[PDB]
Amino acid sequence: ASKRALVILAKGAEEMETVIPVDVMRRAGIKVTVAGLAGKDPVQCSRDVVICPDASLEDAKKEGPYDVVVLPGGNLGAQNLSESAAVKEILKEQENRKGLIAAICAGPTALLAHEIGFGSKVTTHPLAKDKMMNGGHYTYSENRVEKDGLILTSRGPGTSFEFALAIVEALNGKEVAAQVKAPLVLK
Amino acid sequence: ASKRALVILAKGAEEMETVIPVDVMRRAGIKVTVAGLAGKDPVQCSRDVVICPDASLEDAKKEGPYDVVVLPGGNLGAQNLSESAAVKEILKEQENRKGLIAAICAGPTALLAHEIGFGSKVTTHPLAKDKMMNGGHYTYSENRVEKDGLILTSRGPGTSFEFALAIVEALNGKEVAAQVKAPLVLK
Ligand SMILES: *[C@@]1(=O)C(=O)[N]C2=[C][C]=[C][C]=C21
Numbered sequence: 338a339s340k341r342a343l344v345i346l347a348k349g350a351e352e353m354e355t356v357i358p359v360d361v362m363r364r365a366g367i368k369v370t371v372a373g374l375a376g377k378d379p380v381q382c383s384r385d386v387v388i389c390p391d392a393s394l395e396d397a398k399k400e401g402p403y404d405v406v407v408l409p410g411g412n413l414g415a416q417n418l419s420e421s422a423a424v425k426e427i428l429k430e431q432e433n434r435k436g437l438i439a440a441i442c443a444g445p446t447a448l449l450a451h452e453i454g455f456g457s458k459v460t461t462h463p464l465a466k467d468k469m470m471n472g473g474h475y476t477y478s479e480n481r482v483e484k485d486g487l488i489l490t491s492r493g494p495g496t497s498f499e500f501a502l503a504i505v506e507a508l509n510g511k512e513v514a515a516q517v518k519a520p521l522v523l524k
Numbered sequence: 525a526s527k528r529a530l531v532i533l534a535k536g537a538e539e540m541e542t543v544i545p546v547d548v549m550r551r552a553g554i555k556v557t558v559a560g561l562a563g564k565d566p567v568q569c570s571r572d573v574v575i576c577p578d579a580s581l582e583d584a585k586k587e588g589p590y591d592v593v594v595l596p597g598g599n600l601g602a603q604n605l606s607e608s609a610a611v612k613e614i615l616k617e618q619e620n621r622k623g624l625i626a627a628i629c630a631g632p633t634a635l636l637a638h639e640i641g642f643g644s645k646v647t648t649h650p651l652a653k654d655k656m657m658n659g660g661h662y663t664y665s666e667n668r669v670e671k672d673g674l675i676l677t678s679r680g681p682g683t684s685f686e687f688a689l690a691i692v693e694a695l696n697g698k699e700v701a702a703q704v705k706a707p708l709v710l711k
């Protein structure tokens with residue numbers, strides 16, 4: 338049976354950090370749902386790329402649970418995720434069922450806001466470190482991708498391929514990740 | 525005065541190869557127009573990400589010329605670009621005025637279709653090499669990014685940041701490219 342991914346898309350999301358994981362996961366045969374935080378309408382990302390979600394978050398939640406919940410970064414996107422009660426509920430449920438949670442760049446600061454994964458080793462964008470580390474509830478890492486059990490984090494647009502391939506490896510295994518990677522022409 | 529980029533967006537375009545250059549160029553202060561080949565409606569990219577263009581190609585052409593014309597890859601996207609008379613006209617005009625043309629992955633095969641830049645050194649996705657080299661009208665390179673004068677080409681999703689930063693360097697200079705690069709957390 339195919340693995341399933343929920344990508345939560347908020348206004349101000351970093352479009353590269355949204356598109357790279359969606360695309361790479363789909364290359365891996367993962368069924369990906371791009372879910373709009375605010376509803377079904379197109380979402381204006383951080384650098385003004387407009388993406389049409391597959392579904393509203395409200396509707397995608399009804400088809401859960403998912404093998405991974407993915408939080409893109411972008412400062413304003415992450416703030417919107419952090420302020421959302423629906424996101425809190427989704428992440429709590431995922432944590433409680435021991436499902437994977439993946440967040441990149443400023444995205445991991447939503448884990449802090451929703452009290453998810455405390456005690457984990459995590460990374461973030463360098464500019465988001467102080468926010469993430471407020472209260473010392475996590476241990477900080479400078480690894481490009483950090484995976485501490487079911488909390489998987491990464492640093493920035495330039496680590497998005499590594500982040501995506503780590504999700505693929507977690508869900509579908511090393512060999513599938515290697516096969517998906519080769520045609521991408523990564524360094 | 526700000527430089528201006530036309531990104532031509534066709535059904536089946538590789539969404540990573542579309543979004544990374546748009547985003548990176550906007551980070552560099554370039555005014556980017558995402559122009560829909562088929563008109564103003566949302567475009568279904570290769571891995572099913574749906575992007576809403578800023579304008580139709582017909583409308584964006586009226587605001588030309590641009591400092592760079594950018595052709596994303598994706599096999600089906602590149603085929604749509606290759607079959608388009610409007611694209612032919614845009615690229616001929618750009619070549620004739622000695623403006624930059626940038627293409628990635630299968631994207632450069634549209635240069636072949638429209639007889640653009642013959643004699644240039646070029647790269648493509650490895651799987652697109654035979655198509656590009658039909659007739660020996662270019663010289664092939666395995667460099668991740670190749671720039672031969674005003675023809676700038678690159679290989680794949682995994683070279684999209686390098687491709688984008690090379691466009692930035694060409695238009696705005698080395699120092700701006702370096703400043704835009706640093707916060708991306710590239711290897
Ligand atoms: C990233 O997308 C984020 O969340 N915060 C940030 C700062 C600089 C570059 C990229 C990002």
Ligand SMILES: *[C@@]1(=O)C(=O)[N]C2=[C][C]=[C][C]=C21
Pocket residue numbers: 520521538541597598599602628629630631649651652680681
């Ligand atoms: C790329 O986007 C293209 O145009 N052709 C191709 C083949 C494999 C991976 C990426 C690409």
Ligand SMILES: [Cl-]
Pocket residue numbers: 351383410411412413
């Ligand atoms: Cl941001």
Ligand SMILES: [Cl-]
Pocket residue numbers: 538570597598599600
């Ligand atoms: Cl393709």
